Amino acid sequence: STGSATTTPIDSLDDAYITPVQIGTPAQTLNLDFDTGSSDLWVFSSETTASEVDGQTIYTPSKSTTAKLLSGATWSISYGDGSSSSGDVYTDTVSVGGLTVTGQAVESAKKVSSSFTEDSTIDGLLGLAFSTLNTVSPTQQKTFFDNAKASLDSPVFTADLGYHAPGTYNFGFIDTTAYTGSITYTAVSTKQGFWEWTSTGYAVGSGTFKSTSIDGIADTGTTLLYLPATVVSAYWAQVSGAKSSSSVGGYVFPCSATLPSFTFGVGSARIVIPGDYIDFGPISTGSSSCFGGIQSSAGIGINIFGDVALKAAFVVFNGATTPTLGFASK
C-alpha cells in the first residue's frame, strides 16, 4: 500500500505545516502537524477542557463506531518549545492520503498548553519519530508509520515541504519526479529516538565549504534551523546589522537586508537553503527588525534540522531494519 497527502503552511511564514488526517467511522478529518521529532498522535477532542479549545476541530470518539477506549492508558508530553498536552487514549481507524491503519492509538487531549489553544489551525500532532519516544503509559504505543510499515510497498516515508507553498508527505514509495539529481543517503542513530544524523559541513553564501561534522535531528515539527553558535555566528556575520538579541530571543537582522544562502552537507552532496527561506519577518507588526531562520542550538542540547533546512530538500525517512536518511535537491 501507499499513501500521499498534501501538507500546507499554517501562515505566511511557514511557521508549521498541517496535513489532513481521517480518524474514525464515519471519518472525522483533523488537520495535524506531522512531527518527525516526536512519537505521539494526539488530537483536540470532545474531552479537551472547554476553555482550552479556541477554533480547533475536535475528535469526538463517541461518534466513531470504530473507536474503543484503551482502558487505563494515559499520556503526557512536553515539547522542546515548552508546550505540552495530556489526556487519555482510544484506538481507532486512521487514514492519511489513502493509507489506512486500524487500531491506531489516538491520544485524546484533556489538557493542552496555551500555545496550542492559541493556534486555531493545528488540531493535533502526528508523530513520526521512533516509537520508543511514545508517551502512552502503562503500555507504550506505536506511531502511525510503525503500524503501517509492514503493509507499505517500501518501509519509507518522504517529506517534501514547500517554501511559502504546499508540499507532500508520501508513505511507502519514493516519487522520482519530485527531486533533481540523485538522493544521497546518510546513516541514522536511533539511540535518542530521533532521526539523528551527521551533516558533513556548511557554507555561507558563496563562501568556501567548511568540512565539519554536525550531529542533529531531521525534525519537521520545528520551524527553524538550530545549529552550533559558531556556525550561526559565521552566518549572521555576513548580514550587515544582524545581532543576537536576548530580549527578542535570538538573532534579528534589518528587514532591509538581502540574506545569503546557507549550504549544508549530506555526505559529499550539498543542500542549498536560499536566503529568502531564512527570513521570518518583523519581530512585531511594523517593526524594521526581522527574525532570523537560523538560530543557535546552544540552549537546546541538540542541533535541529527543522523546516527551514528540510524544505530546501526532498527528504527520505527510510525505516528499514537499519534506518537511514536521504536528501535530494529539488
Residues 16 and 150 grouped into a single domain: yes
Q: Provide the annotated active-site residues.
A: 35, 199
Q: How is residue 276 written as a grid cell?
A: 529568502
Rounded to an integer, what distance in angstroms lies between the CA atom of residue 286 and that of residue 1?
49
Structure obtained using: X-ray
Rounded to an integer, what distance in angstroms lies between the CA atom of residue 210 and that of residue 121?
39
Residues 200 and 302 grouped into a single domain: yes
Q: How is residue 258 written as a grid cell?
A: 538581502
Q: How is residue 27 written as a grid cell?
A: 471519518
SS3 147: helix
Residues 123 and 218 grouped into a single domain: no
Q: Which residues are within 8 A (CB) of 67 and not within 5 positions of it... i.e. 6 or more apart?
A: 24, 61, 90, 91, 92, 106
- Pick from 168, 158, 165: nearest CA to 277: 165
Q: Which of 118, 152, 174 is the last residue of a domain?
A: 174
Q: Which of 127, 157, 174 is the last residue of a domain?
A: 174
CA distances from 38 to 129, 193, 228, 312 (A): 5, 8, 22, 21
CA trace torsion 43, 48, 53, 59 (10° rounding): 40
Residues 153 and 63 grouped into a single domain: yes
Residues 90 and 65 grouped into a single domain: yes
Q: How is residue 261 written as a grid cell?
A: 544562502
Residues 319 and 170 grouped into a single domain: no
Rg (CA), the chain: 20
Residues 278 and 262 grouped into a single domain: yes
Residues 67 and 208 grouped into a single domain: no
Q: How is residue 68 written as a grid cell?
A: 474503543
Q: From the centroid of its chain, how far is CA 4?
A: 17
Residues 190 and 163 grouped into a single domain: no
Q: List residues bridging with 87 in a β-sheet.
A: 75, 109
Rounded to an integer, what distance in angstroms lies between the CA atom of residue 45 and that of residue 172?
29
CATH number, residue 34: 2.40.70.10
Residues 113 and 15 grouped into a single domain: yes
Residues 180 and 312 grouped into a single domain: yes
Print the domain residue range for 222. Answer: 175-330
Q: How is residue 99 written as a grid cell?
A: 493509507
Element (H, E) at 234: helix 229-236
Output the CA angle 77-78-82, nearest 5 degrees. Answer: 160
Domain total of the chain: 2
Residues 121 and 217 grouped into a single domain: no
